[PDB]
């Protein structure tokens, strides 16, 4: 909460090294902001690779959702970072995690033609 805090405005501003310190000293890793968001969305977002490898690795929840029910995986596949889906698929991402509309994280990928995050997508 004191911690979550920081450990939230870390990962907005992209501060690697502030996070691995706030996560050796027990920071919630799924701290809410007012906005309702997460560590793990924030630092996917802004393609932040190493802060979403670390929060995953202390157990960032992976299912976390926005106002529209974009999961981590959504934003990655609507932003086209492919490293950060594929870690995130490796920490158990729901492939078949719908949006508020119905969509998953393939159908983002090809409306915002990310063909090769489409690729991975498809392949599981």
């Known amino acids: 909460s004191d911690l979550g805090k920081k450990l939230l405005e870390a990962a907005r501003a992209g501060q690697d090294d502030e996070v691995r310190i706030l996560m050796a000293n027990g920071a919630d890793v799924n701290a809410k902001d007012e906005y309702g968001l997460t560590p793990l969305y924030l630092a996917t ?7 979403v490898e670390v929060l995953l690795k202390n157990g960032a929840d992976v299912n976390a959702v926005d106002a ?31 949006d508020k509309f119905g969509k998953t994280a393939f159908d983002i990928s ?10 991975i997508l498809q392949k599981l």
């Open 45 to 51: 977002a802004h393609g932040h690779l190493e802060i």
């Open 68 to 98: 529209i029910g974009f999961t981590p995986l959504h934003l990655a596949a609507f932003i086209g970072h492919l490293e950060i889906a594929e870690v995130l698929l490796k920490h158990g991402a729901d492939v078949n995690a719908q």
């Open 110 to 119: 090809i409306g915002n033609g990310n063909e090769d995050l489409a690729e």
